[model samples]
Structures are given as structure tokens and as C-alpha cells.
Target chain A: EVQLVQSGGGLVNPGRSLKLSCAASGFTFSSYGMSWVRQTPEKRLEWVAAISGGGTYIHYPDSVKGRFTISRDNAKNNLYLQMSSLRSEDTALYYCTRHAMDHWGQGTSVTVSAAKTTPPSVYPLAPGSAAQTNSMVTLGCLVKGYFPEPVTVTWNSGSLSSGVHTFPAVLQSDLYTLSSSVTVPSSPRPSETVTCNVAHPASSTKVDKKIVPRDC
Target chain B: DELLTQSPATLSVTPGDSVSLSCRASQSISNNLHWYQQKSHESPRLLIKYASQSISGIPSRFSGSGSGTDFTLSINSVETEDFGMYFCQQSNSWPLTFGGGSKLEIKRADAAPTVSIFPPSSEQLTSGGASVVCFLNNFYPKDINVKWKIDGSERQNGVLNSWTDQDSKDSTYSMSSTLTLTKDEYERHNSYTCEATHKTSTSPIVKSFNRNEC
Candidate 1:
């Protein structure tokens, strides 16, 4: 029943501070220590830091000794990684784990973007001529050209939830491009309307694109 | 980074034999060593956690000992199912390191025999009796046992067992056992079971024929 759930990830500005939290449960947090591991874009897994279960002892690699701070709250059963002076190279998948690494958290992906603040351009792709009425059809929404990351894309005015999959933001030049896809059965009803809603802090109004799926 | 050298890259042993695999570090690593077992086309599973610490879901027959530099993963008595590639890893310093790997292998010829029971053939059946045969095929080591049982009672007087045939293509052996029973005895027994015990099998391969089905 042991589990490690880490805080959600987002884009962080270079030189800014970011604190990641990992809530430990289903076991005595003060008995087994916790550690953080990082996987870079090149897919190299590296150990970041470790904190003793009692929270009295901690160790950091020389590479991150000054920039990384590892701490814990025994009362709340939480482990935190307070990293300062975030660099673009710090954009990687971070993981929290027990000392022996027998249990691991769902990895969090953090991207460092220096691009200017820009709202996403949401485009709902038509089901096209490939849709069949009896089978599942996949509709894609391109949320390209956004900045300062973290965008949510939903389908069918939020009516469709389970089959939605949003890809990580891809950085091209100074802008970020992301894509969202939803899979649903092609309804026999003349047509089914689907809306791709894009939510970003940079946009005052929700950016949306609507398209009705039609069979080929 | 310290280098981990595993000895005897491959170990060949009988299924019931006990053996030890060694992993040595170039320098002291305290108790930061761990062991894992990887089967064919499968993910590496953790066996012993942190030097000698036992992990949950792992069998007690598997144990680890040693600290600093030399470590040994000892199997009390390795079973056929326990054969795989074992590796030791170190987490003491930067850049985790893994051993070259020690493969625990039994002879390629060893395999469990598949057991099947054949009901009495038309010609083998008589008006007052029936004869059934149990076949144990494709087994290695050439040593096996076959026994016939009726319900809770063991039958030996009318049972004949043979292991004289060996397949030259794969070097595997096959055995067949025949049991002759009176029609009254067959009707009286609830079931007739054939047990095939092979050197490479953890338990006897059982094939039963229900009297009602016959």
C-alpha cells in the first residue's frame, strides 16, 4: 500500500525558485528515507539528493549541493525538493522514491521556457474522411504557439473526459507547441459536435475550436 | 565510480543444488549493494534489497550476505523456476553501477515432461475389463517415476511402467504407464489418476480420468 505522489509540474523561469512536494502515505514515513532522481532529455537517470527518514541527515551531490535543498515534514509525511536558480538544463522528468527505490512516484515533467507570454492557438481537426460510424474515431486538437507553459485542453465542452490524452508541450524556437487528442465512438446521429477548449493564464477568455464529426 | 566485477559469468547447476553468486566492488561501498533477477524477455525483479536486507514478496530461500566490497547472493536450494540472470548494483556513490551479471542456468536439456492420459482403446478394452495408458513425454535427465492410483488407493499389481524410449533429436525421454482394471473396479472407483514425477518438475504432473466420463 506504500505510495509516493509528487506535486504537478509546470514551466519555471530560469533563475526562479521551484519547490516540488512528494506526499508519502500507507507506511511510516519516519522509518524509510526518500530520494529524488532525475531523467534528462537524453534519458540518463541520475540521483539528485537523499534525506534520512528521521529528517536529521541529508546528502546532496556536489553538482547540486548549493542549488538544491532537500527537506521533509514528518507530521505531514511529505518530502520536498526546493531548487533555486533553475536552469534551462533542469528541464527533465523528476521522480521521488523510497531510499531503496523499491517504490516510485509518477514522474513529473518540468520544462523551463524563456519564451514570452502568449496564448495558445487551438485548432480542432475535423474527423476527416477516415471516420467510420461503427468504430472509434480519434480527433486531434493542435494547441500550437504558446508560451510560459501549462495549458489544459478538453473535449466536447468537457462532456468527454475518459478518452482524452494531451501531449507534453514541444518547444520550437521561442514558442511551445502542444497537441491533444480524444477517442470516441462515431455516433450514428447525423453528426456529433466536439469542442476543444484551451485554458491558459495568458488568455482572458477560453480559446476554443469546435468541429462536428461526420462519417466518410 | 567504483567498478563491480561479477565472477563466473555463468553458473550451471542441478535444480536441487544450492549455489552462491558473487559480486565484488573495487572499493568499500558499505551496504549500498542490491540484487536483481532478470528472466528472458522480462523486466528485472528485485530480489535482495540493500546488501542483506530482505524484501517483501521474495522467497526466504534467497538470501544476501556481505558488505563493503564483497557480496554474495545465496540460494538455499535453487529450484528449476529460480534459474535466471542475476545482477548486483551499487548505489553508494554518483553514477550507479551494475555488475556484468551472473547467469544461473540449468542444462538446456532439462525440461518438465507433459503428462497426458489416454482412455482404453477399442482393441484394448474387453467385455469385462479396460486398460488405460498415461504418457509422460519430452522430459530430460532420463529419470522419472510413474504411478497409478484409484481414488484413495494405490494400484501396483496390474500397473506396468516403461521409460526405455529416448528421443534422439532432442535428447529427451518419454515414459508410459499402463493400468489394467476390471470393469467392476472401474465402476467402483470415482477416478483414476496418473502421476508423472520428473527430476526437473517441482511436483508430479497429474492427469486424471474420471470414471463417469469413461
Candidate 2:
């Protein structure tokens, strides 16, 4: 059972850099690079930098060069990222994604909202592209774009809503893409509509897309 | 970012056949590479890692040995459970990469579902309702669609249940589904139909019937 625990986060003034840390357990630390990832209002998952597990090499995404430094303490099983020249936008959630990101740290959210956050995107897919009336079915919900994150993504079918086929949020390009899927029973329900509702307070709205079952 | 390409994108084999799967990289990635196996209707899972090291809980039959730009993951003897999609991933560089993925199948060998109806008797016809059942037996994976028609019209409201039963020395099993209906409804319709649709059959295996003395 691998676990990644991140350091506490809070308010940080503009132009003043803040240090983020992640402690890892359950595997050989030096076997993989301790990679740092960040999420902001403008960018989804921004790869800041990475360090060799033994405190050897460091790599940055060019955009973070000179502004971010990644380091590790092998003896302590801890990885750290120090961001210099902090801008209001520099404030974001940071975590460690090492071992091919198979594990991640509890995000330490650093808030410095300067510019407005972007509206998140919603995508939905029904099981097998359509549902078979006599069989149990499911709905796939994808939450993309930007936000600190929502408490929960609800499906109007309204039973015990649970997530399946979930992927931890990964920052790519400038947007963070996260996925959550919920199982649904057809109820032999035709003409019954289901929708994915989001609770982002900015740049997006409720019911990004409406979904339901299609039968054959 | 580097490139990893998988060859022979599709493979068809039978149970007990030895197989060799290949993964090639554009440049030498040392031994920092891995392979994954994915089953249909399921998620992919890691199979082998680096060059020769094995992961926890993987079968001993599954093994690999190659480095630099070339790698091969071999199964000493393939089983029906091993059939799936296989892809390779290399962690040697920043932008982790994967191969296009190759499919391993057991080849075409199973039969399609054959269906029948437990026609209602005279007493059942007179009675307002009796449990009439439509039976289907012996089907392969593609036999997912089963439809019932009454007097050439589509029928609905059928409660269904089916399970797999092993047969033949090959250890191959057959699966079945039963459709439930009211005897009064079946008798009043005068005719009933049970159709099993499968890719194995050019036309659906359809059976249409009328009242029977038996």
C-alpha cells in the first residue's frame, strides 16, 4: 500500500516563493524520480520539475526553469519543490507524482488568485455506447478544465452514487483532466434522462452536458 | 519524448500454444521499460518490468529478456485467460511512452446459441396465466442479443436468467438465457418466436412456432 503525504498549504503573498513537500512510503524511493506537479486556474496539470530519488539530477519543463527548483532528501524519503519569483498566478495546488504517478500526495493547495479561473469541461458516455434494457448499465463522467475540485459529481439517477473507473487528476498542457464514472441501472428506463451536474463557482455552469440511456 | 512501437498488432492462438510478443523502441532506453496486458471489457495491468525483473503476484509462465531498443515478453504456454490486448510502456525518459498494443485471442472455435420455447399445453391455454419460458442454450461471447416475438410482433416484459455450464472434454462451456412470460399471453398470441443473434451466424438463429399437441 503506497501512500504519498504532502505538506500543509495556505496563503502566500505575491512575489514571495513558497516551498512544497511530499513524503513517500511503501517502495524503493531511489528507484524512480520524485516528480512535482502543479495545478492553477489558467493551467490544469503543469509539470514543474523532477529530481532523481538519490538527490542526483533535476529536470524542469522549461517554462518552470529558473523559477522552480526540485530536490530530495533520500535519508528522509522526502521530495521538495521550491518556487521562486512567485506571482499571484503562481499560487496553485502542488503534489508529487512519482513511480509513473501510480501514487500521488494529498494536494497542498496554495491560493493566490490573481486572474480568473477557467471554466471546467464535462464529458459523458453511456456504457457500450447504449444500454441493454434487461441488463445493469453505467455512465462515464469526465471533469476537465480548471477548478480547485468539486465535492462530488452527481448523476440525477439518484441512488447510491459511487465512482468507478476513476483516474486521479493529471495536469496536461494548460488544463487538468480528471475522470469519474458511476454505475447506473437501466430500470428498463427509456426516455429517462440523466445529467452530469458540476458545482464550479466560476467560468463554468451547472449541467455541462445532459446524459441518459439509449436502448436497442 | 521517445517512440515505442508494437508489432503484429493482432495475434490469434489456441490454448496451450507458446507465444512471443515483441516491443521495439526508437532508441536505447537502457532497461527502463515495462509491459502490460489488458483484457476485453477490463482494465490494463502491468505484466513485466525493466528488462528481466518480475513484479509481485505475476505468473511464473510470464517472462521477458531483452534490452537497449528491443524487448520480447513471452508466455511459455498461453491459456484462455491470457487472451487480451498487450501494450508496452517505457519509463526511460520524461514523456513516458507506450506501444500501440497487440491483441491475443483464442481464435474462433465456439458455437452460437440455439434457442427453443417450452410451448404452453392445452390446460395452460385455457388457464389465464402459467409461467411460459423461452430457452436458449449453447452460445459464444458474441451471442449477447436475444429477442422474442409473439405472432411476428416484438415481445417485451421478459424476466431473464442465464449461466454457464461446462461440457465436452475440451473443458469448453455453454451458456444460456431464459425469457419468462404469461401462459395466457403465449396461448393468445397463437405463435411465438425465439431469435438468437450472433456474429457467428450470417443470419440470426430464429425459431418460429405454433400450438403443439405435446
Candidate 3:
């Protein structure tokens, strides 16, 4: 039967990138392209991209075009995906699929833990309370299960921090579940709204919540 | 296409809860089995397919067990990422076949969770007169197929492989296969591949490597 075997889990600090692998067996390497996808602990799926065995064609979704890349070695029939600019947001489970994911590897978890700083927020603080005017505030999203990792939390307004947000490596339980978080700041607020969007290898969805100023 | 049935149809699990899904083939599938995840608006993501082959870049918490008539897709612990709909598919038939989606929800009803896996990488190596070792750890199933390819040429007779089955806490199981290559053939070959196939009509999972890269 067709089988997909994957690598193990990893933990990395912020600012460092991680590379994961998905190898195939029992099938022709040239017959199909290997595709990569991301899933957050929360279980959201987003398509990162796909690559053929020859390493000639790499396809990233419009959402993650610059941040992700896929490659493969025809001789080995193995496929790879590289994610750059490691951030706490990048922490989640990643998986590889064969010819429409008819078969799949076990999956690997990656966590970005170092350079742990809070993310910036968009909502202003109450009129009098201590709110950093220019400093960044971290908005964090913690996922529970699944592995590898999912996409970062993005603002619905489409404005990301001119500065980068970091995703940490996934922390796991004995049962093999994962936990991860990402932080953003308040300085990037084009509006008083921030959205924690979760994207995975095949699909993505967001949970919208509002942050308001407390009456100081 | 063959019709595959996933029991319960829907699963509700609390955070930290362990859950399993059963995929049954209406008729004997010969051995081609797969599982996947689908969320609103996104394409389907492969989870566990064909016995116990785990996809690369996916999380460790997510795993697959069993083979043949009985297959299980398990999430070790439930988390927010573990939420979503799951499906089981079979590659034993043409056009492939998939199970109806199984919606996984938070038992508490208050929390919404998501499930995800990592991308995979592949490589090819040459035997170069040296014996090549293949590891299939944590795999279940007593019957497995392992074969080899030389320089794009098929060579089944020269390859020798073995299989082993493992049992876990809850009646779960895994299997693996290993192969050995001869020095003479390894040195003469420009490229070599080792593949494991289940007894089925679907395509086999193949890994290829070349001498230069080795």
C-alpha cells in the first residue's frame, strides 16, 4: 500500500527557521507532487504549498507565497518544505500528502520558544490606564492538539506589524497533544480590532474577538 | 470507487481527551487506506493513510494504527487544533475513495478547537555496494511488502526485507519493514529505491536514493 513516513518533532527558539520532511514509498515519485500543509494546535488547516520530485516547481498559496517553499529529490522520492523567519506564530503541526493526500505521513511538531516577546495590539488602552503608546503588545493564540503547526494570527484589516511577530515551538503532553502561542502589539492598530486567524495545510478559519479600552 | 464507512459519523472530545475513529471498507480494500482533514473553505489535509505511515512535518500527537478491515485514526490528546472534521479514504480503487467527513467538536461546547499536521520531505540514496537499512518503527500490521528499484529499473528478486508488529496500551498496533542490499549491486547501481506496499490495488509508497547523493 502507498505510505507516507514523516520525521519527528522539534523545538526551536524565535528568529531561527526549521525544515521538515515527508518521504514516500510504494509509489512512483514522478507520478505525483508532494504537498505541504500547516495545522495549528487549534486544528485549523492551511495550504502552505507543494513541490514536484524534480524540485522544479514550487507552489505556495497567495497567503504564504513568500514565507514558504517546497522542494524534492527525484532519486529519493522525498519531499521537503522550508519555512523562513521563525516566529512564535509559526509554531504548529506540519504534514505532507501524496497525490491529493490520499496517503499521509505521521506528521511532526515544531515549536518556536526563544526570543519570546509579547506581540503588539491594535486596541488602545483605557483613557487613563498604563498603555504603551509606541511599544508593542502581544496578542496570543494558544492551540491545544494536532501537530507540526498552523499559520500565524493576522489582523482582519490586512495590516501586519512592520516589525515581525514570533511563534514558539509546540509544547506537548504525554498523550501527544500540542500547545503553542503567538504575541502581537497594540502599535500596529489601524483599527480597534484584531483577529486571531488559524490556517492549516488544507483549510483555514479565524475566530474574531474585539479588544476595547477599559474605563480608567 | 469503493465505499468506506466511518463509524459514529461525529465525535465530541474535551480538551485533553483521547479519541479514535474507525474506518471500515464496505468490501475488502486489498490494503489501500488513507485519512484526511477538511475545514471550511480549505482543501483536504492528509492525516493517516495506508496502515500507519505518518506524514512528515505533522505533529507527533497525531498518529494512525491498524490495517486491513480495521483502521483507527487517533489524536493522542485533544487540543484546540485537534478540532475540525476528519475523513478516511482508500486508494485501492480508481478515482480513489473517501469517507464522509467526521466532525470533531469540543465536548464542553464552549471551546472551539482545530487539528493540524506538518509538511513532509523526501530523499533518494544509492546503495553503493553497501547494505541499506530501512526503519519502520511504530508501524503495525503483520503483512507488508518491501521492494527495490535500480536505476529506474525494477529489481524485486535481489531485495530482502522483514516485518514486525507492535502493540500499544489500548489494543493498538504498528508494523515496520527492513531491507538489505548486496555490495556488488549497490556499487553498480546509479540509483536505488526501497518501497513498502500493502496488498492492494493502489500505488505503493516508494523512496528513491542515488549513489552520487549518498
Candidate 4:
């Protein structure tokens, strides 16, 4: 029975920021944090930023940093977002979300003046650890982040007997992230290195991470 | 403290076919296992937990039937939309270990996918940046090749499309993809389109939206 009433949207000029709110009810508001996400027409849901109901903690995707801010009011049980210094690409359909999109507010639209947009900054987070089995292992390279756009994933080394690479992007607001993973069917012996590389058109740089299993 | 390994990495069958999928753990996970489902492009959703305990709001057709270090998820008389990726997760420790996902494939449908696009909102036509959602409905096998276009150019990047399942005696499929026009693109206000190249159709499904429609 959780219900989220999203604001009917409006227009704003480029370079100026606008704050959108999601008034929540139908469940324990405190148990959930406010997630602001923007889905651009290009087809990806980007995480912007999020705030706890009481304005306690906040998070922004690496690319969404600085320009986006999330604020929550405990009393009102509302999640708020401000996308500042707007770019034409900032115009989007925004939604307040659960960490999972299982529930959320209906979308509200924002129109910002148009200008050519560039890809947002992209970064690969700490490559996750490898899970060991008797002989085969399962590894997830999770939480690669981006904004306004996203990237592709590649395991730098170690051939996987079989594997599944996924984006499973969380649009906390406007961040679009991509992560890569390397799977070793056989546990690495001492002094062996396993690397995963992240590739994006946003930059020439490649974030290559290697796990030299503490076998040394 | 143990590892999880799911078996039969791939399963393909006809809709209306009942099935059983298994997840095994190297050590005891007891009753601390949960089940999740992920369709092609979207994030995974919880299906069941505590081995066989049900989660509210989930359909009765979807149920879990195993426990102990070994678990098996049971899906009754599957429908078309039931196709996708399934995985098992263990929560015995702070760092819950998960088994790799198994891809589920059901038989493709014989029906043509219908396509339609919602016109842009007023604020969109005015200031630019239009949020347009396009529906590709009632296709079979749950697989469709969807692509976005702006004035005939292959629209890549910033694209997000999702699936809305239809499962029952008459299980078919429906999904939608959204396309946004950047303010500058809105400045021209020409045309936008969504083209779905489904597996069964000789002719691709195309839904177009012109600037004047809004």
C-alpha cells in the first residue's frame, strides 16, 4: 500500500537548478531513504543523489557529484532533489525510488534549455573480491559509476570457464555507472594477478584493477 | 563461510511447461537462502526468501520449494514473461555469497508486437527535452530487438527500456522504451522513433512520433 505522489513537472532554463520533491506515505518513511533518479530519453536511468528522510546521509554517483544535491525532511517524509548549473541534458523524467525500483513515485518531467551535452565523468570503483568454490569461483565487479551516460565492462585477465557480466545500474538520481569483472575458475596460486578493465567513450583513460591474491 | 554453486546454467522450454531450477551451497546455509529474478536489461527483483517462505504481493504461481544447503525454486506452468535470469543468494554471514545466475528461456510467441509512442508533454514541446515512452506490446518468447532513432539516426546512449510481464493462461509479453530529446534537439523539433526488430517478424515493428504530434 505504499504510495508516492510525484509532482507534475515544469520548465527551467539551462544553468539553473531546480528542486523536485517526493512526499511519501503508506509505509514507514524512516525505514527508507530518498532516491532521486532521472531517466533520459536516450533510454538509461541515471542515479543523481539521495538523502535519508531526516537529511542524515546523502550519496551522489561519481559523475553526479557537485552538481546534484538531495535533502530529506523527516517531519514531512519527503525526498528532495536539486540539479544545479543545468545543462540541456538535465531536462529529464525524475522519480523518487527505493534502493530497488520495486516501488517509487510516478515520474515528473523537467525541461531545460537545449545545448549539446557531453558524457559525464566515469570511474570504476574497487574491484570486488572473488568467491571461492572447491575449484570454480564466482566474482562480481560491482558498483562502477557514471552520470548522464554509461559505459561497458571487460575482465582484463583470467579466462572464465563461464560468466555473466551485468550493469544492474541503480539510478539513485542521475548517475550512470558500468563495472567489469574477472572470473577465475581456478583459485589463483601465490603471486598471480587478476585484472578487470572498464571502458567508456567519456574518456581515453581505462581503469584496470588487478587482484594479486594475498598469496604473496 | 561457504560458497554457492547453481546448476544447469541454461534452461530453455516452451511456455506452459512446468520447470524446476536448483541452487547448491558448498556448506550449510540452513534456511537463509533467497531467490531473485532479472530480465535482460533491468535490475533483479526478489522472488522468495527464507527458502520456502513467501513474500507478500508475489503471485502464487511463483514459489520456492527447497531448503538446507540445497535449494530448488519451482515455477508452475510457466508463461512467456516468466523467461529471464534467476539466481540464489545466501545470507548466513555478514558477507552473503551468491551463486551465478541461470538464464531462463521460454518458447517465443507467434503474435506480432504492437508499437505506440506517447506524445511529449507541453513543457517538453516548450523548453525542449521531451520524455517519450514507446510501447512494444504482446510479443512472444520475451525477446525483442529494440532500438531508438532521432530523425533516422541510430539513437544510442542515454537509452533505457524495461519489460512489464504478462503471465497467466494467456501469457504473452509487453514492454516499453523511452526516448528523450535534449533541449538542443528539441530546438529543431523534428521527429523521433522507436523500432523493434523482433525475432519472428519479417518486417520490423516501427512506431514514429512527429514534432507536431505534441
Strongest candidate by DockQ? 2
lDDT, candidate 1, B45-152, per-residue tens? 568878898788888889999999999999987887787788787888865666878877565567897665645433223456555656566677767888888885
Task: Write down the lDDT of every candidate, Cα atoms only.
Answer: 0.71, 0.61, 0.52, 0.61
lDDT of 2 by residue, A126-171 (tens): 4333212344455545565564444255666344354223334444
Q: What is the C-alpha lDDT profile of model 2 across B28-74, one tens digit per residue? A: 99998777775643334567778677778888889988899999989
- Model 4, B8-115: lDDT tens digits are 787877878878889998887778888877675544567887888767888877888766688888888887778888878676653345677677766544767756
* Ranked candidates, highest lDDT first: 1, 2, 4, 3
**What TM-score quantifies how close candidate 4 is to the native fold?**
0.39
Candidates, ranked, TM-score? 1, 2, 4, 3
Where in model 1 is the C-alpha error above 4 Å?
Answer: A1-10, A21-32, A41-44, A53-57, A72-78, A105-110, A127-139, A148-150, A157-169, A180-190, A200-205, A213-216, B2-54, B58-89, B94-214
Docking class of 1: incorrect
In candidate 3, stretches whose alpha carbon ends up further than 4 angstroms from where it belongs are A115-216, B1-84, B87-214
Q: What are the TM values for chain B, all candidates?
A: 0.51, 0.53, 0.49, 0.60
**Higher-TM-score candidate among 2 and 3?**
2
Model 3 lDDT on a 0 to 1 scale? 0.52
- Is candidate 3 or 4 superior in lDDT? 4
Give one digit per residue, the lDDT tens place, for model 3 in B1-214: 5577787676766778888888888777755776787754344666665668777777887888766666788888887766778877675644345676577755431211111111011111121223343322222233455665667766655333332212222111222222334455456657656565643326665655554321
Poorest lDDT segment (10 consecutive residues) of candidate 4 chain A: A122-131
Q: What are the iRMS values of all candidates?
A: 23.2, 15.5, 23.1, 22.4
Which wins on DockQ, candidate 1 or candidate 2?
A: 2
Worst 10 residues of 3 chain A by lDDT: A120-129
